[PDB]
Amino acid sequence: HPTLFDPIDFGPIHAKNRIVMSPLTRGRADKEAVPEPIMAEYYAQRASAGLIITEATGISREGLGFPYAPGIWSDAQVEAWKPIVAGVHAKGGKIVCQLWHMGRMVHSSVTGTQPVSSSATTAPGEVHTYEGKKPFEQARAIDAADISRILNDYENAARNAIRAGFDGVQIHAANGYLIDEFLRNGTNHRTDEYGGVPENRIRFLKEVTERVIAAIGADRTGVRLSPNGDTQGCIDSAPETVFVPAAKLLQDLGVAWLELRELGPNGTYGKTDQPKLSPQIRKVFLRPLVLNTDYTFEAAQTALAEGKADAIAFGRKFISNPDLPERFARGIALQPDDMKTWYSQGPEGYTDYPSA
Template identity: 55%
Template sequence: MPSLFDPIEYGSIKASNRVVMAPLTRARATRDAVPTDIMIKYYEERASIGMIISEATGISRTAVGWAYAPGIWSKEQVEAWKPITKAVHAKGGKIVCQLWHMGRAVHSQVTGSQPVSCSPTKNPGHMHTFDGKAEPELAHELTIDEIKGVINDYKVAAQNALDAGFDGVQIHAANGYLIHQFIGDDTNLRTDKYGGSLENKLRFLKEVVDAVVDTVGPERTGIRFSPNGPSQGVFVKDNEHVYLEIAKFLNEKNIAFVGLRESSAKSTFWDTTTQPKIGKQFAKVFKGKLILNQEYTREEAIKAVEEGDADAISFGRATITNPDIVDKLKNNIPFVVRDDTVKYLYSQGVEGYTTWP
């Protein structure tokens, strides 16, 4: 019977325990999406976590419209990530880079260009910019040639991640961002080979996976989904059927790990859900390592791993206020909990970033 604290291998990534740090947008990079020195300490302090999944990291300027989020498309960004990955490795940790394209969920005030997506739709809610919140803009529908360009951006970003010292990458296909938009029923309105049938709606996802796997290998590749939506207005109606089809494809590609963010009626951050969780069904189909996420308690996390519902559990906000989360989980020490944690996700500076005990 496996334990949450047992070692685990995600393909070629050998982690010392089955606790995972979920990706968290922390907004401590520069306006040019270059990682900063305070990020070294932040990640280093959490290196006892079996595997760190970096904050969502843009594959191009067009891809990342979140103010002060980091990127991985330029040489300057690669060089700035190197001391971060080196610091994590020096403490015995593992870290993978989450590859991010936000699609329509950006604003031109940050990217310098119109948002792009599979179809000309608008993201709900407000966009985060350097000057505060802004109204969403209509997305430009990607042409076939532009889609090829985005796929190449994933290839370049994946190679850059390895060059920066990351142990692998995770493709962000969740939370209403570009890949999710292609899969969604209300966001993908295309009538060409990327729209209409399920096969066509999954084509972009599959081509991105192929590009990344060809670049870094399946043993260094993971992917993240939020299968029971909606997420930022993206809704997959027959979610169980769709994601089990995806699981079959990922098996064929020998993907190392999948992360599922599964909302529930009790979720307290971002969207809740109108669909049942599919983690158990997914685990029966997918043969790689499965990481589950969404506000797990210590007892729930231990039980899920022991009973085989998941190979590992990722924690998000708890890793902000508890850099020593693995020690606290092992010894049943209560987490530091702050009601204002969310405000520290998107602010700049060290407060709420590297100031936790």
């Protein structure tokens, strides 16, 4: 019944509308993963979103291989995030930090360590580094000490996000990164309690989520999953058997909201024949469900009207339409985004898309 323009509560976050800015890596931080001041303008321009989910933000150097992406493990990073978050709040916006461990999707020339994963696998193709593209290296399967350390890193990152002023966090459990590499049977070949049957494959997500919620509260914790379709070499052969139980687990843990990146056979940023799991997940996760990928404004309105989702997150539309909610409301045409400047440096194709 609520429309995209009606408010929604994501835990304690009182969002003014249900038009969410999806997480978008842009590479406008520095080589120490410290946010740069231009990022304050970028997010402030987009503060009419009901909720902004930040670009994926590294919880550690081990888990952050993306050149010029920000982190949130250090005091210097927290201090740099503070004015970015404050500028959004000054405009009445709300913003959560997407906490990232990239798992096998890193190169050791950026992280200084071998890529880590559920199993000793290699992502397909080549990886974007500071020196250009390099073939992926084989990851190492994390051990018990690694798991303990990575949980500490998630805890520290969640506390640091709150200390920077973020309204909450979203756990990046999607897109073939570390958690997703445990969830899906295409990448998880472990023989211990983290591998095999779906309950075991969910265990790493469970333990990460439990540690984050014990630090900042389940009501300030959201999660992103990407249940259907190969992303970055990560797929499950029967996604319904693991992603529906994962969503039920998140519901039981008290997770405040769940975002699903869902592909289709004609997808324009990833395509697949695996069907969307949102109808099944909607039955087991009962708090706000945010859907994402290839939504026209009309399709987004239909999804809320038919009770399929509580809110819709838009990625590429927010790149090029900082005033997306106002354009929707006023019937104004949308500016196309320039993929050439998605991941480049500086303001071009970043802060120079005008509002209408």
